Amino acid sequence: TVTYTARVANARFGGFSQLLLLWRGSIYKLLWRELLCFLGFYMALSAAYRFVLTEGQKRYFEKLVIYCDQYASLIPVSFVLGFYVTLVVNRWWSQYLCMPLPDALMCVVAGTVHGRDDRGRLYRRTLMRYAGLSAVLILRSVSTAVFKRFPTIDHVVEAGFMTREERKKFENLNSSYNKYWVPCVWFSNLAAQARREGRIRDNSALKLLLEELNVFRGKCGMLFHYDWISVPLVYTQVVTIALYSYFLACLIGRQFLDPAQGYKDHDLDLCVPIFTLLQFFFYAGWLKVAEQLINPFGEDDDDFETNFLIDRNFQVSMLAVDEMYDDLAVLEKDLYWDAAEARAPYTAATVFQLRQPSFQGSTFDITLAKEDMQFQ
Amino acid sequence: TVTYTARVANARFGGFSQLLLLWRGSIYKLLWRELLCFLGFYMALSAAYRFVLTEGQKRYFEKLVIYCDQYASLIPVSFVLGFYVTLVVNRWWSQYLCMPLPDALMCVVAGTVHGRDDRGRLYRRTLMRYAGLSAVLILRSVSTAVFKRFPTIDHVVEAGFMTREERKKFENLNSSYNKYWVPCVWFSNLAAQARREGRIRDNSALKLLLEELNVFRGKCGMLFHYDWISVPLVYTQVVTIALYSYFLACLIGRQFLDPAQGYKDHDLDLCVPIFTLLQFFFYAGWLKVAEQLINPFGEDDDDFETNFLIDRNFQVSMLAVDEMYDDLAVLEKDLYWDAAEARAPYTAATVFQLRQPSFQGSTFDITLAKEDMQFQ
Amino acid sequence: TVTYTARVANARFGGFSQLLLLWRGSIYKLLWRELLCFLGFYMALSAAYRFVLTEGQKRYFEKLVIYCDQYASLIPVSFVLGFYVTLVVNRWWSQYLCMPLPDALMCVVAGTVHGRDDRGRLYRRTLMRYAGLSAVLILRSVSTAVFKRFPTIDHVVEAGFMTREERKKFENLNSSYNKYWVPCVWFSNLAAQARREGRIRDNSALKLLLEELNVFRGKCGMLFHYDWISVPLVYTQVVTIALYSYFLACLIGRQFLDPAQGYKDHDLDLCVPIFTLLQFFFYAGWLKVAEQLINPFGEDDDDFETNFLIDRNFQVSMLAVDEMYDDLAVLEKDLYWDAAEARAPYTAATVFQLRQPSFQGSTFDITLAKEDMQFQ
Amino acid sequence: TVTYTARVANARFGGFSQLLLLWRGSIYKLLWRELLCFLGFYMALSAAYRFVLTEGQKRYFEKLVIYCDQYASLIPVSFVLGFYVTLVVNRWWSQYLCMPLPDALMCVVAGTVHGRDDRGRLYRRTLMRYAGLSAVLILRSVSTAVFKRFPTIDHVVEAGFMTREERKKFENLNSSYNKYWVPCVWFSNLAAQARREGRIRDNSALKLLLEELNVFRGKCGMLFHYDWISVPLVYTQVVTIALYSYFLACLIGRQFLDPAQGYKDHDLDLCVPIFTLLQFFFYAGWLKVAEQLINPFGEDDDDFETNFLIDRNFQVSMLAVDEMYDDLAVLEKDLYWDAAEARAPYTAATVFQLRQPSFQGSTFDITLAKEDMQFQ
Amino acid sequence: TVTYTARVANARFGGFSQLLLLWRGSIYKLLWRELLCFLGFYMALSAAYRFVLTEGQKRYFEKLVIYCDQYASLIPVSFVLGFYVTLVVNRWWSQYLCMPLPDALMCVVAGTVHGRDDRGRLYRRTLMRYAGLSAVLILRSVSTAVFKRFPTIDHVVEAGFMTREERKKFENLNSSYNKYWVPCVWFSNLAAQARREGRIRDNSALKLLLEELNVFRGKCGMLFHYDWISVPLVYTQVVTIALYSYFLACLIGRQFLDPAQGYKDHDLDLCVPIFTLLQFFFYAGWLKVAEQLINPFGEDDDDFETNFLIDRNFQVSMLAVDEMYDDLAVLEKDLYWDAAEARAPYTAATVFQLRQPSFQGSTFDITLAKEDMQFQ
Ligand SMILES: [Ca+2]
Ligand SMILES: [Ca+2]
Ligand SMILES: [Ca+2]
Ligand SMILES: [Ca+2]
Ligand SMILES: [Ca+2]
Ligand SMILES: [Cl-]
C-alpha cells in the first residue's frame, strides 16, 4: 500500500503535480515497459516508411495511415474503461473491507471471558489465536505474499498460530475443501466450554461472542469468495481487446506522413507523437489501475499489506486479551468533574479555529416576522 | 466459474495480454459464431457488389453505403451497453452473494446444540441437513445444472438430503407454490424441540439459531426472487435492438467501395474490414458479458458452480456439526505465552517486506513548531 | 412480471435474438402506437413536401431541414436517459425488495408460539393473519391491481384477512391517515399477551417476534414511502422534454430532400427513414423502460404480481404456522451417518461436472523454491 | 411533495406527455424566469445586431458569432451535470430515508410498556412524546417550514410536544450545541425507570426499546449531519459555472447571421432560436432538479412535507400507544380455519389475473432425457 | 466545512448564481493561482509569437498550433474526471459517516449504568471519557488539525481526555502500532466490572453496552483504514496526467493566429482566450473538488471540523451521562391527554400548508365500476 494522505491533506497550489513525482506504486513504474514497446513499434514503422519503402509503397502506406486514422474513436474505449475500472475499484475496496480484523472479538473476549489465572489466560489467548489462525489460513489461501510467508501448515505451526495437537486434528479432519473454518468451529466449541465452566458468566455474553465470531468468519468466507469468483474473464478480455484495437489504430494512423504530399491535417512532421504518447499513457494507465487492483493480494506496491496486518492483528489481540485484561486504572475524577461544561484547550496553532460560530441548524437565521409566528 | 486471480495477482509486463490467450469462458468461445455470421454477411454483400451488380446497381449501392455510413453513431450504443452491462454485473454479484451458505448456522449449531450421544448427533445433523435441503430445493428450482442433477424429489431423497418420511410429509403438504421454505420451518420446529429437551441450553442460543436460520432462509428467498424477477425484457430488447441496428449500419456502410470512383474517405480497398470486425468484437463481447451473466445459474463456463457448492456445503456442515463437535485440543500454552509482544517469523522470500515502516497515521510527520504546540 | 430466465440460462448463439421475438411485456407492445404516430407525422411532412409545396416553399423547406439536421445532438439525450433510467431501475428493484414477505415471521411463529390446541392454533393463525392484513392494506393503498381486488374494507373482510370485530375496531380508530400499521400494533399486543399467558416461552422469543414484526412493518412503510415520494416530476419532465425535442429535430431534419438539388449528404432518397425509425425505437424504448418501471405496481406486463404474492404469502404462512407446527418426521439417521465424508450422487447429464478440480485458493500453484520457504 | 404515481401506474400511449401538462412542482414553474431572461438577452443581442450596428460592426459581430459557435461543446457539461445531479438525487433520497419515524418505537412501546391505568398510559404517552419532541427539535433545526411553524421553544411547548417543567430542564441544560438528543436521553432514563418499576416486564424488552430508540436518534443525527455537511460548494460552483459558460457561448454564437453574407451553416434566419431555447430548457431544468433537491427541507413544491409528517407521526403514535393498547378483538377462528389451503376471492375486474401459471422456478420446463436423470 | 443549505433551501430565480459570489471554500480560492499560471503561460506564448518570432518561425508556430488544436479531445478527460471525482466524493461521504459519535453510547450509558452517587457518576463519566479518548486518539492519528491541537499524549492528558495513571498504563503497553483501541478495551473491562458490581443491572444491558462500544470502535477503525488505504496513486496520477495533457494541448493550440494568414477557423483574434480560460476553470475546478475532498481531515475550508466535533461530543456526552441522569421531569398528563386525535397548531406563516389533502395512497382515486368490484 502506497500512502499519500498526508501529502494531499490540504488542497495546495502544487497539489497533484507533486504526486506526479512519486515513483513507488506509480503509473511510470507500472507502464514504462509498455510505453517503450509502443514507442519502439511506432518508431520502427516510422523508420520503415522513411528509409525502406519505395515511392509506391510509401504512397500506399500514406493511404493506409489516412484510412486507419478515421477509426481512432476513443469515446467507446473511454466508456468501457470507465465502467470496467469503476467496477474493479469498487470490488477492490469491498475486498479490503472483507479483511478479517480481531478488534471486535478481542474487545468482547476481554469483557466477557474472565479469570486472571492461567486457565482464564489460556481461554482468552486460545480464542484470539483461533481467530488469528482462521485469518491466516484464508490469507495464505488468497494472498501470494502470505502464502510465501506460510508455504505450509508446518510454517503455520512454527509461526505459533497452530499447535502440534491442533495440527494433528486439522490434518485428521477429512475434507477436500479449504479448512479455514475449522478454527472458527474450534472457537465455537471453546466458547461453549468456557460458558459451561462459568468463565463466560452469561448466555448473553456467549451470544455476543458467537455473533462476533460469525462476523469474523463471514469476512473470511467473503475473502474466499472474492478470490474464487474473479471479475468475468470475458469482460476483462473485452476491455483489453478494445484498448489494444485503439492502440493499433493509433500506432498505424498516427504516423507522420510526408508534408510534401499535401495531405489534409498532415503538413507538420514532429518525428515524435507527443500527443499519441500522452493518450497511450492516459489510457494504458487507466487500464493499469484495474490491472493492479484486480487482485489486491499480490505483491504490487499498492496491494494490501496482508503480512503486516497479520502481525498487527496477532500482537494487538494478544495484548488486549492477556495483558490489558482487568487492569483498569483506579477510577478517579476527571478534569471537568466539577465543570458544568467541558472543552479541551486549543493550541496556538489551532486556536484560530475558535471564533467560528457553532453550527446549530440551517434555519436559525430566518428571522421571520412577529405576526407570521402566531399560532392559529 | 473461470478463475484467473493467480494470473493477475501482480501487475506484470504481460498483464491482460496473457489472459487474451485463454479459451475457457472466453470472448472467443462466446462470440466466434456471431463473428463468423457477421463476416459472412459482409463478404456476401462485398462479393455481390464486386461481381453481381451492374454499373448502375453499383452506383446506387455506393450511394446507399455512403448514406448508411453516416448513421454509424456508436456513442448511444456505448451509453446503453455501459449502463445495461453495469446493471447486469451488479445484479450478478448480488445473486452470487444471495447463495445460501451453512457456515454460520453450522458454527452456531456446534456451539449451541449439545450432546455427544446419538440423539445430540441426530439433532445437529438433522438441523444441518434441513438447511442443506432448503438450499438444494431452491437451487434445483433456479439452476439448470442443479435441476439436471436432481430432476425429481426422488433424486433429492436418493441423494440423502431428504428421508422417506420427510418426503411423505413434504408431498402431503398442500401447496401450489415452491416449498423450499418447508425445511426452514422444520428447522424452527426442531430447534424449539431441542431447546425444550435441554439440548439447547438457553433461550439466547435458541434466538441465535433462529436468527441464523432466518438469514439462511432469506438468502434462499432472495435467490427465488432473483430467478422470478428477470431484468426487464423491454430493457434487454432495447439493448439488443440498438446493437443490431448499429451492426446493420456498419455491415452496409463499411463496404469497401471502388477507389476508382473518387469518393471521399474511400481511396483504399482492403477487402477485409479489420477495424469494423474489431468494433464488432468489442461491442458484441460487451453484450455477451451481459448475455452470460444475466442468468448466472446456467451452464456457461463463468456460471456459478452450484453443484460443487452443494457438495462442499453439505460435507463441511456435516463435518463441523458431527466430527468437530466438542473435540477441542487440550488447552495448551502457545508459543508467545511469556513473550510481551508477538510477531510470527518471515521467510527468506518475504523478509524483504520487513523494514517497511509501520503505518501509525498520516499526521505523524508534521513536526510542528514548539510555540504552536502550546495550549492557550 | 415477464420471466425469461430459463431462456437466457446459457449464453447461446441465438441469445437475445430469440428474446426479440417475445410480445408480452415487450418493446413492440409498449411502443408500437408511438412508432405509428412518429411515422405518420414523418410521412405527412414528406408527402406535403413532395406533393403540396411550391418550388419556393420546397426550397425554404430544404433550408429548414438542413438547419434542423444540425441540432440532432443525441449525446446529451443519451446522457440524460442513461442516468434517469438507471435511477428508475434501481428504485424499481428497491421497491420490489421493500415488498413485505411473511416467511421470517412465520418461521419465528412456528418456532416460538406453542400449543397444539385450538388456542395455540388461534394465536399462530391470528399473528400470521395480522401480518397478511397489514401487507394487504398497504398493497391496496399502493397498487392498482390490489385495490381493484379489494376496493373496500368490506372486500378485505370478505376475503378473510379481517374479521367483523376487527373491522369495527379498525373503523372506530380515529385517524385521518393510512391505517396499515394497525395490524402491526395488534400483532405487538397479541404477542405480548401470548408471552404473558406462557404461549411464548421466553423473553428472547418475544424479542425475536417483535424484531421480525418491526422488519415487516418497516417494509410496509417503505412501500408507502415509495408510493408517496415519486421520482421528481421536474426530472421526469426534463427527460421527456429532451426526448421530444430530439425527436422533433429528427422528424424535421431527417426528411429526404430532392437529390436533384445537389445538397451535401442529400443525394439518395429512400422514402422511408429506416435508421431514424431505428433511432426512435431505441430511444423511445429506453424511455419506455423507465415509463413501465416508474410505478411497478400498475397493470403492466412487467409490473409486480402483487395479487399472486398476496395469495402465496397467505397460503404459505397459514400452512407453516398451522399444519406444519410440531409436525416433524421422527429423528432418523441420515444416509451418511457412518460416512466420514459426504457427497451426493451425480446424474449422467451432470457427472461431467466432476473431474473439475476443487478450488482451494489462488495461491496453491505458486511452487516456490526451498530456500525461499525458510523462516528467518 | 408532488405525487404522480397513480398517473404513471401503467405505461400508456400518452404516458409522460400528460405529465408534461402539470404545473405544480414542474420545470415550467422552476425555470420560466430563467428562460425569459435568456430569451431577453438573446433578443436584445439580435435586435442590436439587426438595427444598431453599422456594417463593419456587423461584420465583426458575425466573425465573433462564428468563433463562439465552435465552443458550444455540450458533452462536458452533460458529463458534469449528469454526475452532479445523480449525486444530488441519491443524497436527496438518503436524506428522506433519514427522516425519523415513530412506527417501530410505538409498536415496541405498545408491546412492552404495560399497565392499563393512568400511570401506564403516562409512561407510553411520555415515551412517544419524547421521540416526537426529538424529531420536532431536529426538524425545526433543519427545515425552514418546520422552523416557521415552531420559531421558538415556546412554540414547541404550546404545540404540546414539551411541557413547562421539561422546558425548564431543557433550558437549564448548559450546552452551546443543538439539544435534539435531550429527549432521547430522557427516553432512556424513562425506559430504565419503567423497567425498574416493572412496567417493562423484562430486560429483553428494555434492550429492544433502547435499540429502537438508538435507531430513531441515529436518524435524527443523520438529518443533522445532512443539514450541516452540504454538497461541496466547489462542486456546486463548478457545475453552475460550466452551465453558465455553455449558455453564454450559445447566447453569442447562436445568433442568426444575415443570410446575404453567405456564411456556412448560416443561410436561414428564423428570428428565434427554437432549438437553442429547447437546449437551454433541457440543461437548465437538469440543473434545476439539483437546485430543488439540494435542500429537500425548504418550501419547494417537491420538498418534503415535514409538517404533515410531524402531525401524522404524533397522532399515529399517540393512538397506537394509548387507544390501541391491550384492546385486541377477541381471538376468533378465521375464514380458512378448516380449509387446507387459503386463497382470497378475486373481483370481476381482476379475475383475469388468474389462469396465469404460478411461478415455481426457471428450471421446471427443461424436460431432460430419461437416461440423463440416472445417478452414477 | 462550508454550509450553504439555508441559501439553497428553496429553488429560487437567483439560485446558484448567488452561490457563485461566495469566497470561502470556493472554486476561486482553490484555483486562482493555477488560473494565473495558465494565463501567464498562454500570454507568454502569445507575446513571443507576436513580438519575438521571425516570419518563418511564426509560420512554423502556426502549423504547430493547428496541429495541436486537433488533439483537444475533452471527452476522455471528462470521462476520467467524472468517474474519479465520483469515487472521491463517495469516499469522502463514507469517511464522514465513519467519524465516531458518542450519542448512542451515551444514551445506553445513561439508561443502563446506574447510581446517583460518586461511584455511579465515575462509572458513567469514565466510560464516556474512554469513548472520547479513543476518538481523540484516532483523530489525532488521521487529522492534521487534531494533531496540531494534540501534538503529544501529554497534550491529550492536559486536555483531560486521559489521566496520569491511564497515560502510564498506555505507555507501558508494549505495541508498535496505533493504540486507539486501548480505550475501547478499557471500556470493555470497565463495563464488565460495573456489571459484576451491580451498577449495570442485567446481562442484556451489558450486551447492549458492548454492542454500542463495538460500533464506536469499528467507526474508529474505519477512520484508520480510510487514512491508511489512500485512493490508488496510479489512478490519481492518471487523472492528473490526463488533465495536464489536455491543458498543454489547449495552451498550445488555442493561440490566436494572425487573421491575415487566412487559416480556417482563425480569422478573429481576441487576444484573450475567454472560452479556453472558462474550460480551464471548469476542468481544473472539477479536479480541485477531488483535490479538496481526497483528504477531508486536512485544513481546507470544506474539510471536516474535527476539533469542533471533538468538543461537542465531549461536552454532550458528559452532560448526558452526568447531569441528565435520573432527573426526568415528573410524569404529567400531556396537552392531548383527553383528545382522541392529536395535531399541533400552525403559525400564520405556515397555516397555508393545511388544506393540502392528506396522502392516503396512489390507488384511492380509481373509482372503479360497481360490477367490477364483485368477488367471483
Ligand atoms: Ca495486484
Ligand atoms: Ca448464464
Ligand atoms: Ca408500471
Ligand atoms: Ca429545496
Ligand atoms: Ca482536504
Ligand atoms: Cl439480543
C-beta atoms of C308 and D353 within 8 A: yes
> What is the crossing angle of helices D274-293 and C233-253, to 10°?
160
Q: Which residues of A touch B86 (CB under 8 A)?
A: 83, 86-87
Please state, in angstroms and rounded to a whole number, the distance separating the CA atoms of residues C310 and C297: 13
- Ramachandran class of A265: left when φ > 0, alpha when ψ lies in -120 to 50, beta otherwise: left
Please state, in angstroms and rounded to a whole number, the distance separating the CA atoms of residues A83 and A79: 6
Same domain, yes or no, for C179 and C220? Answer: yes
Quote the cell numbers at residue E174: 508494549
C300 labelled as ligand-binding? yes
Resolution of this structure in Å: 2.6
* Matching residue, cell 443502563: E112
Please state, in angstroms and rounded to a whole number, the distance separating the CA atoms of residues D82 and C82: 9
- Which residue does chain B place closest to D342, by CA atoms? B175
Contact C27, C281 (CB under 8 A): yes
C-beta atoms of D366 and B147 within 8 A: yes
Residues of D with CB under 8 A from a CB of B: 340-341, 358-364, 366, 368, 372-373, 375
CA distances D370 to C22, C349, C353, Å, are 30, 10, 19
Contact C256, B201 (CB under 8 A): no
Same domain, yes or no, for D202 and D216? Answer: yes
C-beta atoms of E188 and A365 within 8 A: no
Q: Across the A/C interface, how many CB contacts are shorter than 8 Å? A: 45
Q: Which residues of B touch E295 (CB under 8 A)?
A: 362
Contact C354, B310 (CB under 8 A): no
Nearest Cα residue to B181 out of D354, C209, C312, C99: C312
D324 occurs within a structural domain: no
Return the C-alpha torsion angle B250, B256, B258, B262, nearest 10: 70
Nearest Cα residue to A87 out of C18, E223, B38, B88: B88
Please state, in angstroms and rounded to a whole number, the distance separating the CA atoms of residues E232 and A8: 13
Ligand 5 centroid to Cα of residue E82, in Å, is: 19
Task: Among D155, D159, D227, select the one facing A361 at the smallest CB separation.
Answer: D227
DSSP C338: S
B36: CB partners within 8 A, 6+ apart: none
**From the CA of A95, which ligand is nearest?**
1
Q: Which residues of B touch D354 (CB under 8 A)?
A: none
Return the C-alpha torsion angle D245, D247, D249, D251, nearest 10: -150
Q: Which residues of C touch D369 (CB under 8 A)?
A: 349
D121 occurs within a structural domain: yes
When computed from its CA atoms, the radius of gyration of chain E, rounded to whole angstroms, is 31
Quickly count: other Cβ atoms within 10 Å of residue C236's Cβ: 25
Nearest Cα residue to D146 out of D85, D214, D100: D100
What 3-state DSSP class applies to D370?
coil
Please state, in angstroms and rounded to a whole number, the distance separating the CA atoms of residues E105 and E128: 8
What 3-state DSSP class applies to A201?
coil
C-beta atoms of A366 and D174 within 8 A: no
Please state, in angstroms and rounded to a whole number, the distance separating the CA atoms of residues B4 and B19: 8
C37: CB partners within 8 A, 6+ apart: none
Quickly count: other Cβ atoms within 10 Å of residue A259's Cβ: 12
In residues, how long is chain D? 376
Contact C126, C327 (CB under 8 A): no
Picking from D228, D250, D275, the residue at the C-terminal end of a domain is: D228
Task: Give E265→chain C minimum CA distance, Å.
Answer: 18
Same domain, yes or no, for D88 and D108? Answer: no
D119: CB partners within 8 A, 6+ apart: D199, E331
Same domain, yes or no, for A190 and A159? Answer: yes
Domain range spanning residue E143? 103-228
What 3-state DSSP class applies to B162?
coil
B313 occurs within a structural domain: no
Contact C144, D9 (CB under 8 A): yes
Task: Among C9, C129, C214, select the one facing D334 at the smallest CB separation.
Answer: C129
Task: Among E144, E158, E177, select the one facing B363 at the smallest CB separation.
Answer: E144
For testing the chain C interface, which of E10, E208, E362 should be mutated: the one with the most C CBs within 10 Å?
E362
CA distances E95 to A359, D215, E88, E198, E309, Å, are 20, 20, 10, 38, 14
Displacement of CA B164 from its chain's centroid (Å)? 35
Q: Which residues of A touch B315 (CB under 8 A)?
A: 175-177
Same domain, yes or no, for B195 and B171? Answer: yes
Q: Which residues of B touch D373 (CB under 8 A)?
A: 148, 151-152, 155
DSSP D359: P
What 3-state DSSP class applies to C347?
strand
Q: What are phi and psi of B173, to 5 degrees?
A: -60, 130
What 3-state DSSP class applies to B213?
helix
When computed from its CA atoms, the radius of gyration of chain B, rounded to whole angstroms, is 31
Same domain, yes or no, for B89 and B175? Answer: no
E203 occurs within a structural domain: yes
Same domain, yes or no, for A118 and A208? Answer: yes
Please state, in angstroms and rounded to a whole number, the distance separating the CA atoms of residues B326 and E199: 35
Ligand 1 centroid to Cα of residue A300, in Å, is: 5
E10: CB partners within 8 A, 6+ apart: D144, D295, D298, D299, D300, D303
Q: What angle do CA E364, E368, E372 make, to 5 degrees?
A: 135
For the stretch B326-331, contacts whose Cβ atoms lie closer than 8 Å and that sit 24 or more positions apart, written own/partner, are B326/A189, B326/A192, B326/A193, B326/B114, B326/B116, B327/A169, B327/A189, B328/A186, B328/A189, B328/A190, B328/A193, B329/A163, B329/A165, B329/A166, B329/A168, B329/A169, B329/A186, B330/A165, B331/A119, B331/A122, B331/A123, B331/A126
Q: What are phi and psi of D261, to 5 degrees?
A: -65, -20
- Which residue does chain C place closest to A159, by CA atoms? C375
Contact B346, C376 (CB under 8 A): yes
Please state, in angstroms and rounded to a whole number, the distance separating the CA atoms of residues D210 and D113: 13
Same domain, yes or no, for A112 and A22? Answer: no
B237 occurs within a structural domain: yes
Contact E350, D145 (CB under 8 A): yes
Please state, in angstroms and rounded to a whole number, the distance separating the CA atoms of residues D224 and D139: 9
Experimental method: cryo-EM
Task: Among B4, B204, B320, select the one facing A230 at the smallest CB separation.
Answer: B4
D344 occurs within a structural domain: no
| Helix segments in C10-115, DSSP class H | 16-19, 27-51, 55-69, 74-97, 103-112
| Helix segments in chain C, DSSP class H | 16-19, 27-51, 55-69, 74-97, 103-112, 118-142, 144-149, 153-158, 164-172, 182-197, 203-228, 233-253, 274-293, 306-318
Same domain, yes or no, for D246 and D217? Answer: no
C-beta atoms of B177 and D358 within 8 A: yes
Task: Give D153→chain A minimum CA distance, Å.
Answer: 12
What 3-state DSSP class applies to E266?
strand
Displacement of CA C270 from its chain's centroid (Å)? 41
Contact E231, D231 (CB under 8 A): no
Torsion A97-A98-A99-A103 (CA) sign: positive
What 3-state DSSP class applies to B303?
coil
C-beta atoms of A332 and E299 within 8 A: no
Same domain, yes or no, for A179 and A119? Answer: yes
Please state, in angstroms and rounded to a whole number, the distance separating the CA atoms of residues D151 and D145: 10
Same domain, yes or no, for A221 and A111? Answer: yes
D11 occurs within a structural domain: no
Picking from D246, D270, D288, the residue at the C-terminal end of a domain is: D288
Picking from B256, B272, B293, the residue at the C-terminal end of a domain is: B293
DSSP, residue by residue, E135-201? HHHHHHHH-HHHHHH--SHHHHHHTTSS-HHHHHHHHHS--SS--TTHHHHHHHHHHHHHHHHTSB-
Please state, in angstroms and rounded to a whole number, the distance separating the CA atoms of residues E285 and E277: 12
Same domain, yes or no, for B221 and B145? Answer: yes
E312 occurs within a structural domain: no
What 3-state DSSP class applies to C375?
strand
Task: Give D341→chain B minimum CA distance, Å.
Answer: 7
Residues of B with CB under 8 A from a CB of E: 340-341, 358-364, 366, 368, 372-373, 375
Contact D145, D306 (CB under 8 A): yes
What total of structural domains would you count in chain B? 2
When computed from its CA atoms, the radius of gyration of chain C, rounded to whole angstroms, is 31
Quickly count: other Cβ atoms within 10 Å of residue B97's Cβ: 13
